[PDB]
Each structure stands twice: as C-alpha cells, then as structure tokens.
Amino acid sequence: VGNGPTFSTGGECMNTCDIQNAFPMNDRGVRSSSPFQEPNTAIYDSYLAWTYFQPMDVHIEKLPAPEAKYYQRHTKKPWDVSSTELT
Amino acid sequence: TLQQYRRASQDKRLDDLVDLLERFKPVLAREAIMQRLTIKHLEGQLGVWRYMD
Amino acid sequence: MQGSWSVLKKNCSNFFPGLLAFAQQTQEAYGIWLRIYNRQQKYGPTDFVEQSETFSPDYHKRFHSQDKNMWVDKELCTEVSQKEVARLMTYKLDMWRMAHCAGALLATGGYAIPFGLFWLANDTWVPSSFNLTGEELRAWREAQDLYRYRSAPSYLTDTKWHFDFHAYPWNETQERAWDDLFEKNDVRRDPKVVRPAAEMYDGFIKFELIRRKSLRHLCRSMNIPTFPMLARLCNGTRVRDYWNLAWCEDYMVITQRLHESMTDEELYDYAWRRYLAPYDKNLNREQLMERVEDYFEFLGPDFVAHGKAPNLVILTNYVLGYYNDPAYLEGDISELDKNDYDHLASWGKDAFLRRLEFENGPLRDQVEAHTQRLLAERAAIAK
Amino acid sequence: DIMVPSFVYNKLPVIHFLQEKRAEQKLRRVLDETYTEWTEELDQAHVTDAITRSLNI
Amino acid sequence: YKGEVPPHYTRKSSATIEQVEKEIDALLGGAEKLRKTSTDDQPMDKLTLMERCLRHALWSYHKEEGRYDFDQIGRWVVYTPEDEVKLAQLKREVEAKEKLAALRKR
Ligand SMILES: CCCCCCCCCCCCCCCCCC(=O)OC[C@H](COP(=O)([O-])OCC(O)COP(=O)([O-])OC[C@@H](COC(=O)CCCCCCCCCCCCCCCCC)OC(=O)CCCCCCCCCCCCCCCCC)OC(=O)CCCCCCCCCCCCCCCCC
Ligand SMILES: CCCCCCCCCCCCCCCCCC(=O)OC[C@H](COP(=O)([O-])OCC(O)COP(=O)([O-])OC[C@@H](COC(=O)CCCCCCCCCCCCCCCCC)OC(=O)CCCCCCCCCCCCCCCCC)OC(=O)CCCCCCCCCCCCCCCCC
Numbered sequence: 001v002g003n004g005p006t007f008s009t010g011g012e013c014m015n016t017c018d019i020q021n022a023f024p025m026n027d028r029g030v031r032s033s034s035p036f037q038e039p040n041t042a043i044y045d046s047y048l049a050w051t052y053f054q055p056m057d058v059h060i061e062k063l064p065a066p067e068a069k070y071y072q073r074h075t076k077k078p079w080d081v082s083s084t085e086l087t
Numbered sequence: 088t089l090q091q092y093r094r095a096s097q098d099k100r101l102d103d104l105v106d107l108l109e110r111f112k113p114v115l116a117r118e119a120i121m122q123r124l125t126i127k128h129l130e131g132q133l134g135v136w137r138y139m140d
Numbered sequence: 141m142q143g144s145w146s147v148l149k150k151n152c153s154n155f156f157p158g159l160l161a162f163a164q165q166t167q168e169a170y171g172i173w174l175r176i177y178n179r180q181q182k183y184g185p186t187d188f189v190e191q192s193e194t195f196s197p198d199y200h201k202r203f204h205s206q207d208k209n210m211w212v213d214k215e216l217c218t219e220v221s222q223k224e225v226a227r228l229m230t231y232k233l234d235m236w237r238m239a240h241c242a243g244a245l246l247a248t249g250g251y252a253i254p255f256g257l258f259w260l261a262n263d264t265w266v267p268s269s270f271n272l273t274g275e276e277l278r279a280w281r282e283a284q285d286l287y288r289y290r291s292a293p294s295y296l297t298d299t300k301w302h303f304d305f306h307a308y309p310w311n312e313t314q315e316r317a318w319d320d321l322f323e324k325n326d327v328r329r330d331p332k333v334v335r336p337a338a339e340m341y342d343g344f345i346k347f348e349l350i351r352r353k354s355l356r357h358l359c360r361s362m363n364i365p366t367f368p369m370l371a372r373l374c375n376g377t378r379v380r381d382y383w384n385l386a387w388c389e390d391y392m393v394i395t396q397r398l399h400e401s402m403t404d405e406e407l408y409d410y411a412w413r414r415y416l417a418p419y420d421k422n423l424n425r426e427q428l429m430e431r432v433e434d435y436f437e438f439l440g441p442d443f444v445a446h447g448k449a450p451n452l453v454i455l456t457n458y459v460l461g462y463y464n465d466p467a468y469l470e471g472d473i474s475e476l477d478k479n480d481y482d483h484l485a486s487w488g489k490d491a492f493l494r495r496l497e498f499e500n501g502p503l504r505d506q507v508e509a510h511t512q513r514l515l516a517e518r519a520a521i522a523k
Numbered sequence: 524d525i526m527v528p529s530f531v532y533n534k535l536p537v538i539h540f541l542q543e544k545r546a547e548q549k550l551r552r553v554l555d556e557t558y559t560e561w562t563e564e565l566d567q568a569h570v571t572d573a574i575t576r577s578l579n580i
Numbered sequence: 581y582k583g584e585v586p587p588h589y590t591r592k593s594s595a596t597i598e599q600v601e602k603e604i605d606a607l608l609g610g611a612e613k614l615r616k617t618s619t620d621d622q623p624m625d626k627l628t629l630m631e632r633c634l635r636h637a638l639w640s641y642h643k644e645e646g647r648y649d650f651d652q653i654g655r656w657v658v659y660t661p662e663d664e665v666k667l668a669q670l671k672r673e674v675e676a677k678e679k680l681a682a683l684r685k686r
C-alpha cells in the first residue's frame with residue numbers, strides 16, 4: 001500500500017471529541033478518523049490520545065458508473081473556483 | 088367501462104412512478120460516488136480537495 | 141458579472157438617451173409616489189402615519205416594525221394601477237443606484253471619471269433605461285440575476301446557521317418547515333409545509349431585530365446598493381418601502397386575479413421583481429404561474445383578510461431560495477480512478493510508518509496478541 | 524491561506540453527517556407516504572338478482 | 581353506483597408500463613451485489629426501500645389494470661393484514677370465475 005496521507009484529524013481522538021457522533025464506529029468500537037467507514041482504525045496513547053487510520057488494500061463492491069445526467073450540475077459561475085484549482 | 092373509470096388514477100400513478108424513478112437515480116449516483124471516494128480513501132490517495140469537489 | 145469593453149461601448153452610446161429616459165421616468169414616478177403618499181397620509185393608520193417607535197429589547201435601537209410601520213392599502217386600485225406600482229418599484233431601484241453614483245460624483249469632483257468608466261463597463265449598477273434594445277435588456281437582466289446568485293446564498297446561510305446554532309424548533313412540523321425552507325431550487329417547496337417557519341422565526345427574530353450584516357446581504361441580493369451602508373435604518377427603510385409596494389400590488393392582483401390575464405412577459409417581470417423567476421432559467425408560463433401561486437399561498441389567507449404578511453425575513457429567504465442553485469459538479473466519474481499522492485511514492489515509508497503499517501495492517505491481531513502476552517509475562521516476572 | 528481553510532476542514536465531517544441524515548429522512552418520508560388503495564366494487568350477485576327480477580320470475 | 585367519469589388528465593411525460601418496468605429492473609439489477617438481505621425486524625437499506633416502493637407502485641398499477649398476478653402482489657403490496665385479507669378475497673374470486681366459466685362452457 002502507498003504512503004499517502006488521509007483525512008486530517010488535528011491530533012484528536014474521535015471517541016471523546018465534541019463531534020464524535022459524526023464519525024462512524026466500526027465493529028471493534030473505534031470511531032473513524034473521517035466521515036468514511038474505516039475497519040482498522042486504532043488509538044495511540046501519547047501524553048494525549050490520538051486516533052489513526054492505516055491505509056490498506058481492500059476490495060469494495062463497486063456500483064456501476066451512473067450517467068452524467070444524474071450527478072453533474074452545470075451551475076458553474078465565473079467567480080467559482082474549484083478546490084483542485086485553488087490548491 | 089371499468090377501464091375508463093380507473094384511468095386518471097392510472098395515468099397519474101404512472102407519471103408519479105416515473106418521477107420516483109428519476110428521483111431515486113441520483114441517490115444511487117451519490118452512493119456510487121461515495122463508494123469510489125471511500126475506495127480511494129482506504130488506499131491513501133484521496134485529497135480533501137477532491138472530496139469537496 | 142465582470143466588466144467588459146462591449147458593455148462599456150453599449151453604455152457609452154446610450155448614456156444621454158438613458159439619462160433622458162431616466163428623467164422622464166423620474167417625473168412619472170414622482171407623480172405616482174405623490175398619489176400613493178397622499179393616500180397613505182390620508183387613510184393610513186395612526187401608528188403608520190405617526191411613525192410609531194419600536195425599540196429592541198437589548199440595546200433599545202429603533203427599527204421599522206412589520207405590523208405597525210408597514211400598511212397595505214387594500215383600496216389603492218382606485219387611485220393607482222398595478223402597472224404604475226411596478227413602474228414605481230423599478231424606478232426606485234434605478235434611482236437608488238443613480239443617487240449613489242451622483243453622490244460619489246459630487247463628493248469626489250472630477251476624480252470619479254475613471255470610476256465612472258469602471259461603472260459603465262458593467263451592467264450591474266447601471267439603470268434599466270440605458271438599454272435601448274431587447275438584447276441589451278436581456279444582458280442587463282442576466283447581470284442582475286448573476287449578482288442575485290452571488291449574494292443570496294450568503295444571506296440564507298447566515299440566517300440558517302445562526303438559528304440552528306443558537307436555537308432549535310419546538311415541534312416536528314416546525315422542524316420540517318425549517319428543513320424544507322432552505323432546499324435548493326431544483327426541488328419544489330410546498331408553501332403550506334414551510335409557512336410555520338415564519339412564526340418560529342418571529343419567535344426567534346423579527347424584521348425589527350434584523351442585524352446589519354444580514355441586512356447588507358439581503359440588500360445585495362435585492363440589487364440595492366450598499367456603499368455607503370451607514371446605519372441599518374436606511375437600507376432597512378428602502379427594503380420596507382419596496383416590500384410594502386410589492387405587498388400592495390400583490391393584494392391588488394390577488395383580489396382582481398390580474399395574473400391570470402397578465403401576459404407572459406409582464407408575468408415574468410412580476411415574478412422577477414419578487415425574486416422568484418430568474419431569466420436564465422427560461423421558464424414558461426406554467427412554471428411562472430406555479431411559483432406565483434406558491435408565493436400567494438405562502439402569504440396566506442391572513443394577508444387578504446387583514447393585510448398582514450408573514451415574517452419578512454423568512455419571506456425573503458423563501459423567495460431568494462430560487463436563486464440558490466445546486467452546488468456545481470463537473471467532471472466524469474472516471475476521474476475518481478486517479479490518485480492524488482503519487483508524487484510521494486518516491487519517498488517511501490520511514491521506520492515509524494513501517495511500524496504503523498505492521499501494527500495496524502492485516503497482521504494487527506497477531507501483533508496485538510503477541511505484545512499483550514509479552515507484557516503480561518513481563519509483569520508477572522516483575523511481581 | 525491558513526485559518527479559514529482549517530475551520531472549513533473542521534466543519535466538513537459534521538455537515539456531511541447531517542446531510543446524510545437529511546437524505547435518509549427524505550427517503551423515510553417518501554416510504555411512509557405509500558399506502559395501497561384497496562377498492563370495493565359492487566358485487567355482481569345483486570346485478571344477477573336484478574336481472575332475474577326484470578324477467579318477472 | 582360509481583358516478584361520473586373522472587375529469588380527464590393529461591400526462592406530463594410519455595412512457596409505457598412495460599418500459600417503466602424494464603427501467604426498474606435495469607436500475608435494481610446493478611445493485612444486486614451491493615444489496616444485502618436482513619431480518620424483517622432489522623432496519624432496511626436504501627436499495628431495499630427503493631425496490632419496495634417501486635414494486636409496490638408497479639404492482640398496484642398492474643392490479644388496477646387487470647393483471648392479477650397474486651404471487652407478486654402478495655409480496656410487493658402486502659404490508660397490512662388487511663392486504664392479506666384482500667389478496668385472499670381476490671384469489672377466491674378469480675378461481676371462482678374460472679370454474680364458473682369452465683362449467684358454463686361445458
Ligand atoms: C469631509 C467631511 C467631513 C465630515 C465630518 C463630520 C462628521 C461626518 C459627516 C457625515 C458622514 C456621513 C454619515 C454620518 C452618520 C449617518 C448615521 C445614520 O445612518 O443616520 C441615519 C438617521 C436617519 O434614520 P431615522 O430613522 O430617520 O432617524 C434615526 C433614528 O432616530 C434612530 O433611532 P434610535 O433608536 O437609534 O435613537 C437614538 C438616536 C437618536 O439620535 C438621532 O438619531 C437623532 C439625530 C441626531 C441628533 C444629534 C444632536 C443631539 C442634540 C445635541 C445638543 C448639543 C447641545 C450643545 C450645547 C453647547 C453650548 C455651549 O441616536 C442617539 O441617541 C445618538 C445621539 C448623539 C450622541 C452624540 C454624542 C457625542 C459625544 C461627544 C464626546 C466628546 C467629543 C469631543 C469633545 C467636544 C467638546 C470639546 O439620520 C439621522 O437621524 C441624522 C443623520 C445626520 C448625519 C450627519 C450629518 C453631518 C453633517 C456635517 C456638517 C458639518 C461638516 C463639517 C465639515 C468640516 C470640513 C471637512
Ligand atoms: C453642492 C453641495 C454639495 C454638498 C456635498 C455633497 C456630497 C455628496 C453627498 C451626497 C449628496 C446627495 C447626492 C445626490 C442624491 C440624489 C437625491 C436623493 O436624495 O435621491 C433620493 C434617494 C433617497 O433614498 P431612499 O433610501 O429612497 O430615501 C428614503 C426616504 O424615506 C425617502 O422618502 P420617501 O419614502 O418619502 O420618498 C421620497 C422620494 C419620492 O420621490 C420620488 O420617488 C421621485 C424621485 C426623487 C429623487 C430623484 C433622485 C435622482 C438621483 C439621480 C440624479 C441624476 C444623476 C445623474 C448623474 C450623471 C450626470 C452627468 O423623494 C426623494 O427621493 C426625496 C428625498 C429627500 C431629499 C434629499 C435631498 C436633500 C438635499 C438637497 C437639498 C439641499 C439644500 C441646501 C440648502 C443650503 C442652505 C444654506 O437618495 C439616495 O439614494 C440616498 C443617497 C445615497 C448616497 C449616500 C452617500 C452618503 C451621504 C452622506 C451625507 C451626509 C451629509 C452631507 C455631508 C457629507 C460629509 C461627508
């Protein structure tokens with residue numbers, strides 16, 4: 001698996017944060033570091049506890065590609081700049 | 088005679104069913120998009136800019 | 141909309157004819173407003189004529205009260221027609237922008253000329269009279285709609301976020317109304333479901349307590365110039381006057397069912413002045429009629445019965461919700477097959493990353509078991 | 524460059540969760556409004572009885 | 581007994597019942613792998629809810645039209661014991677008519 005980063009956490013433990021409910025909980029009882037579902041989320045205990053997620057090779061049943069009509073929204077405006085372009 | 092009586096219900100019901108199908112399709116599209124985003128997230132190749140876009 | 145040379149040439153060519161037309165419209169609108177003001181002063185309620193004071197409960201700052209300082213003249217049709225009211229409203233907008241420009245010119249002498257060049261290069265703040273043909277008018281309307289799109293979402297988000305962060309609805313119906321109020325224009329909102337939000341927000345905030353920033357956003361969304369904004373009771377007065385005229389015209393139309401007999405272009409303009417029908421949507425008569433009927437239903441029977449409209453803040457949010465287009469999404473789904481962090485592949489994994497992968501990877505259970513067993517053995521040996 | 528981006532990033536999860544819940548609520552409301560309309564039609568036995576009476580039987 | 585023929589209605593869109601059924605089958609066929617069964621008392625999924633709504637509408641339309649296929653009607657429309665009663669009543673009626681026609685012919 002790659003060395004790429006993931007959704008940022010800010011060095012916070014999601015099992016005790018004020019918005020913990022927004023983070024899904026897996027079978028082991030460890031809330032995810034991101035809105036996505038994570039099976040191998042863990043918690044490390046330094047002076048402060050922090051959540052971590054290790055990327056891994058996992059296969060997920062991929063729903064077939066829909067049509068562009070049902071997910072594309074051509075409401076773009078001259079002032080609008082996408083996050084990728086901004087980055 | 089019965090067919091004539093049970094007609095407006097039928098046409099309106101058919102139109103409502105078509106509208107319901109068109110309403111459900113975008114939900115499945117969003118679900119597929121989220122599936123792909125999660126797939127890339129688990130691989131550690133997802134940027135927050137892509138997710139927001 | 142951004143400025144352009146073509147629009148600059150258009151406005152420069154039509155500058156003097158536009159000024160002459162504006163002067164003629166000024167005379168006509170002065171006559172209409174004289175009639176309306178005389179009628180208001182003669183038949184208006186005592187509180188409305190005397191300008192009753194309504195102070196806030198926290199800082200005791202006066203502001204217009206929707207119930208007292210706003211009055212619907214049910215019998216205005218005798219003296220003034222609907223078309224005259226619409227003309228007066230359009231002239232009010234144009235006169236506001238022209239007055240701001242003239243004030244700038246007077247203040248800065250001859251140094252406003254380059255700023256005037258910037259002004260004429262864009263149709264956002266030029267009067268409607270500067271357009272002498274259909275295409276020019278269409279472009280001007282497009283610019284106004286673009287400004288409305290640019291401004292309205294901020295106002296809606298301000299209102300929704302403040303309410304949701306500092307309060308919650310009382311009952312389920314209020315919850316549904318609040319949630320459905322701020323839906324995107326791509327879906328149709330039922331006014332009956334949405335109406336209770338008016339009472340809820342009246343419980344939260346009335347038009348007399350509207351904050352200055354929210355007022356600025358609203359005035360931006362109504363194509364009302366905001367610089368110099370000054371105190372909140374000036375643009376607030378402008379908004380009150382505009383919506384009072386709109387309510388009078390709406391009562392006239394509802395009572396006389398003028399919209400059914402109203403032609404397509406006039407109906408589109410009537411909806412547009414209510415911020416219901418953007419021109420870029422290319423709406424047909426059916427959609428315009430549906431939106432107008434929804435607006436009338438939202439006003440509610442009490443509007444006809446007593447001339448009392450729902451909370452003005454919620455009404456503005458509801459009408460401007462038609463300019464809250466769905467968030468744009470461009471690009472084929474296949475783009476999701478790419479990777480974002482390929483440039484890091486050359487760096488590989490360091491010792492800490494390798495340790496994390498080993499501990500939290502597929503072998504995590506084995507490592508955890510081994511570590512726990514070793515720790516237990518060491519603890520037992522220590523004891 | 525630094526502050527507003529960080530706070531937007533902090534906002535993202537809660538907003539995503541709330542919007543998912545809202546979509547689920549919409550689907551639930553769509554489902555809850557579905558009722559099967561069982562209609563009742565005049566029994567043909569009465570029609571047969573009327574036919575017999577018309578025959579003068 | 582019924583009254584007046586109901587006022588005429590104009591369709592907003594043109595589409596056949598067969599085309600709608602085919603579109604529904606195509607939509608539900610792509611999610612078969614993703615679709616997961618569960619206990620009746622357990623919460624339902626988005627796919628299950630969509631399937632139930634679509635099939636309920638389709639089979640209500642079919643039963644109103646005259647295509648009395650009890651096997652699927654009892655599945656995609658029965659959610660109240662009332663509906664089971666209605667299915668049983670309709671099942672007896674169809675069989676009774678078939679037998680009556682056969683003997684009246686014989
Ligand atoms: C280059 C140019 C430079 C210019 C410099 C000059 C200053 C700037 C000029 C103007 C700039 C434009 C914007 C101005 C602000 C606009 C505010 C606004 O939106 O108002 C809307 C508002 C309209 O809304 P509305 O609904 O119609 O009515 C308001 C509601 O009542 C509202 O209802 P409410 O519920 O809010 O009611 C409360 C309301 C009630 O008030 C009002 O709204 C009523 C109107 C104001 C009344 C003010 C006078 C009060 C009585 C004064 C008595 C003095 C007696 C002294 C006797 C001395 C004897 C020796 O507010 C108050 O209570 C405030 C009262 C004022 C308190 C003043 C405290 C000062 C403390 C001083 C500390 C010490 C200073 C240093 C030491 C000095 C001594 C050594 O406008 C007004 O009411 C009046 C606006 C007037 C604008 C200012 C005009 C400027 C004229 C300048 C002439 C001189 C030029 C010199 C040039 C020099 C060379 C360059
Ligand atoms: C030469 C000296 C210069 C001194 C320095 C000046 C520096 C520049 C400052 C600005 C000056 C004014 C600029 C022209 C504005 C146009 C006239 C006007 O008021 O338009 C109506 C309009 C009124 O707005 P509104 O919100 O609808 O009014 C609400 C009221 O309830 C409305 O009441 P309503 O609901 O009952 O409706 C009434 C409406 C009903 O009528 C209609 O609907 C018919 C239309 C009437 C208005 C037509 C306006 C047309 C504007 C465009 C003109 C053409 C421009 C062409 C440009 C290109 C040229 C090549 O009729 C009115 O609009 C009447 C308004 C009241 C009269 C205000 C004028 C007072 C000053 C003039 C008399 C001065 C006497 C001096 C005596 C000296 C003794 C020693 O004006 C505005 O849009 C407001 C001005 C916006 C810019 C504000 C900038 C800050 C000002 C701060 C001033 C502070 C004091 C001064 C010291 C400053 C130190 C920093």
Ligand SMILES: CCCCCCCCCCCCCCCCCC(=O)OC[C@H](COP(=O)([O-])OCC(O)COP(=O)([O-])OC[C@@H](COC(=O)CCCCCCCCCCCCCCCCC)OC(=O)CCCCCCCCCCCCCCCCC)OC(=O)CCCCCCCCCCCCCCCCC
Pocket residue numbers: 141142143240241242244245252253255256257258259260261262264265367
């Ligand atoms: C003939 C004509 C007919 C007759 C006349 C009629 C009357 C005409 C006048 C009235 C017109 C009114 C309407 C105007 C609309 C257009 C306004 C405008 O400008 O729009 C932006 C306009 C573009 O508008 P747009 O593209 O249409 O987009 C409009 C959108 O809707 C975007 O809209 P937005 O809303 O987003 O944009 C708004 C934006 C507007 O602002 C901007 O967009 C910024 C514009 C400047 C950007 C500059 C960027 C580039 C910088 C370059 C630096 C130098 C580079 C190196 C040069 C090397 C040269 C060798 O922000 C603001 O509104 C901020 C307002 C700030 C107010 C400031 C108030 C200060 C008060 C002070 C405190 C006082 C407190 C009280 C104290 C009391 C004490 C007693 O900007 C430009 O075109 C940029 C021009 C840049 C020029 C070159 C750089 C500067 C050159 C300076 C030369 C100096 C020479 C002398 C030097 C001497 C040295 C000794």
Ligand SMILES: CCCCCCCCCCCCCCCCCC(=O)OC[C@H](COP(=O)([O-])OCC(O)COP(=O)([O-])OC[C@@H](COC(=O)CCCCCCCCCCCCCCCCC)OC(=O)CCCCCCCCCCCCCCCCC)OC(=O)CCCCCCCCCCCCCCCCC
Pocket residue numbers: 240241243244247248251265356365366367368369370
């Ligand atoms: C990385 C570095 C980059 C470079 C950085 C450069 C360094 C910057 C460092 C400092 C920056 C911050 C400074 C802040 C200062 C404090 C500001 C403050 O306290 O404001 C409170 C407060 C905030 O304003 P606001 O109304 O609440 O909302 C402001 C928003 O921006 C309104 O936004 P909105 O969205 O609500 O409305 C948007 C739209 C809405 O649309 C409209 O409103 C329609 C169009 C309106 C047109 C204007 C109407 C004006 C009517 C008359 C105003 C009263 C005049 C008073 C008498 C004259 C006094 C001079 O309005 C506009 O588009 C406004 C366009 C204005 C364009 C001009 C902007 C300045 C560009 C530079 C030009 C001057 C360069 C001079 C130096 C160089 C000389 C060689 O200010 C006011 O109440 C405004 C009073 C304005 C009085 C006139 C200006 C006085 C200042 C001196 C002028 C000197 C002129 C010299 C001419 C040339 C001589 C050679």
Ligand SMILES: CCCCCCCCCCCCCCCCCC(=O)OC[C@H](COP(=O)([O-])OCC(O)COP(=O)([O-])OC[C@@H](COC(=O)CCCCCCCCCCCCCCCCC)OC(=O)CCCCCCCCCCCCCCCCC)OC(=O)CCCCCCCCCCCCCCCCC
Pocket residue numbers: 201351352353368370371372373
């Ligand atoms: C490049 C740099 C060049 C050099 C620059 C030099 C800079 C000097 C630094 C010192 C300046 C300090 C003052 C800053 C003013 C801006 C403050 C501000 O924006 O606050 C935002 C503040 C925050 O509001 P928010 O948080 O959104 O909402 C809170 C509330 O909901 C809001 O709700 P609300 O609006 O209902 O409540 C507010 C309202 C509520 O009340 C009302 O509505 C009633 C209005 C009553 C008006 C009473 C006027 C009385 C005048 C008497 C005159 C008698 C005649 C005398 C004739 C002979 C002598 C001349 O009351 C007022 O705000 C009005 C108060 C009285 C205004 C007096 C006129 C301005 C004086 C400015 C100079 C002060 C001394 C400076 C030196 C010392 C500095 C430490 O909003 C306001 O205050 C809005 C109104 C702003 C009006 C002032 C600005 C007008 C434009 C100025 C035009 C002249 C430009 C000259 C340029 C010179 C360039 C060199």
Ligand SMILES: CCCCCCCCCCCCO[C@@H]1O[C@H](CO)[C@@H](O[C@H]2O[C@H](CO)[C@@H](O)[C@H](O)[C@H]2O)[C@H](O)[C@H]1O
Pocket residue numbers: 177178179181182
């Ligand atoms: C530089 C200043 C620029 C100012 C620009 C704006 C000017 C506006 C002028 C408006 C004039 C209206 O004219 C005025 O109307 C009012 C209201 O109908 C009349 O008012 C009359 O009827 C009312 C209502 O029954 C009575 O309360 C009042 O006692 C009586 O006089 C005045 O007799 C008339 O003179």
